Amino acid sequence: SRARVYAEVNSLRSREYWDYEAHVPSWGNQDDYQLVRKLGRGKYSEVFEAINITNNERVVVKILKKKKKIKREVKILENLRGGTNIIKLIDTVKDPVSKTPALVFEYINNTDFKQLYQILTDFDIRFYMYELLKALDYCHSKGIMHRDVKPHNVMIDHQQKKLRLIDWGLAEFYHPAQEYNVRVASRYFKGPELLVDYQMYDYSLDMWSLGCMLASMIFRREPFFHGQDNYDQLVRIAKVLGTEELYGYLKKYHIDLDPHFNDILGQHSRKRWENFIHSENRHLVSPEALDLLDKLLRYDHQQRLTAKEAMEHPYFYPVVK
Numbered sequence: 001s002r003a004r005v006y007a008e009v010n011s012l013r014s015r016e017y018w019d020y021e022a023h024v025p026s027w028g029n030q031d032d033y034q035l036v037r038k039l040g041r042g043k044y045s046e047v048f049e050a051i052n053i054t055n056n057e058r059v060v061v062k063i064l065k066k067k068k069k070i071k072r073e074v075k076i077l078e079n080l081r082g083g084t085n086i087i088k089l090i091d092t093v094k095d096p097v098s099k100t101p102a103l104v105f106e107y108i109n110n111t112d113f114k115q116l117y118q119i120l121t122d123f124d125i126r127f128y129m130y131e132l133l134k135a136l137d138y139c140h141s142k143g144i145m146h147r148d149v150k151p152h153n154v155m156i157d158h159q160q161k162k163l164r165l166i167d168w169g170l171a172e173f174y175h176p177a178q179e180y181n182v183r184v185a186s187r188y189f190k191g192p193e194l195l196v197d198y199q200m201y202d203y204s205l206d207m208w209s210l211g212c213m214l215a216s217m218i219f220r221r222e223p224f225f226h227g228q229d230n231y232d233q234l235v236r237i238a239k240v241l242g243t244e245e246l247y248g249y250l251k252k253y254h255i256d257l258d259p260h261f262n263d264i265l266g267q268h269s270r271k272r273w274e275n276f277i278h279s280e281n282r283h284l285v286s287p288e289a290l291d292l293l294d295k296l297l298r299y300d301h302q303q304r305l306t307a308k309e310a311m312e313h314p315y316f317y318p319v320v321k
C-alpha cells in the first residue's frame, strides 16, 4: 500500500529534513519560565501555562516524560513551524535541577471541547473542521502523519476563532512501504488499520480520526465509536460500517485478522448515516455533512478523502464563502 498523495515528499528532500536521529536540539534554561498553572497531563508529558520572566510573554511549557522520540518531536515541530494552525514551538529547555527536557510553545486560550461542542452551530463545525483540515493538509504536504488526532489535541480559542493542532509526540515521517507501530492514536480515534495490526498505513490514518471527530460533532455522540478495549473498538466500528465490508478490506490488503475477532465481530449490515439523526442533533446534520462523513469513515484507507479533497467538499462552501 502507498499514500495516494505526498508519497515521495520525504525522499525528494535533503536527508537532514527527515533524519531526525541526527538532529541535535540546543537545550536552554527552563529557569527563564515561571510555570503558573497546570493545564493538563497525559502519558507522555505534563503541560503548564507559563510566563517568560525575561519579557513577560505568556507561553505553554510541556515537560516530557528515549532521546530518539524527543528528537522526532522536536524535528517535526521545527519542520512544520509556520504552517497554518500548527502549534508554534518557541524553545527547547531543561530544568537545571531535574535536567528533564521540556518544550515551550505559544499559548492558546482553549475552550474545553466538552463545553464547546455542546454550543457549536452547523456553521461553527464546518469552520473548525476546515481549519483542522488546513493543519492536516499542511503536515501531510510536509511528509508527516500526526497519528493522534482527537478533540483533546485540537485547541480552540472560540472567542478569537483560533485553532491549533497540538501534541506532535506521536507524529512520524511518512516513507512509502515503511512499517509503522500501530500503538498510536487514542482508542476511540484509532483507524481500522491500527485495530487489525496493519503496519503499512499513511496520512489517511489522520482522516479516519478527523471523521470520528466530525461524527461526534454533528451527531453529539462523543466519542462516536466508544470501544471498551482495542478488540471492542473494531466491533463498534463494524456495527456501523458493516462486517462483510470489513472482510472485503482485510482480503484486499492480505491482513491477518486476529482469531479472537471471530467470537465478537458478529454479523452487521452497513448502517445508513441517516440512522444517527434525532431531534437533538438534526440542526447540525445536512446531506453535505453525511456525504463528507461517508467519504472519511471508510475501512479502506486508500479510498478515504485526502485532506485537500475534503477541503473541496460542498460541506465547506459556506466557510470558503
Ligand SMILES: C=Cc1cc(O)cc2nc(-c3ccc(O)c(F)c3)oc12
Pocket (backbone or CB within 6 Å): 039, 040, 041, 045, 047, 060, 062, 087, 105, 107, 108, 109, 110, 155, 166, 167, 168, 169
Ligand atoms: C493541555 C491543555 C492546554 C490548554 C491550553 O490553553 C493550551 C495548551 N497548549 C497545549 C499543548 C501544546 C503543545 C503540545 O505539544 C501539547 F502537548 C499541549 O495544551 C494546552
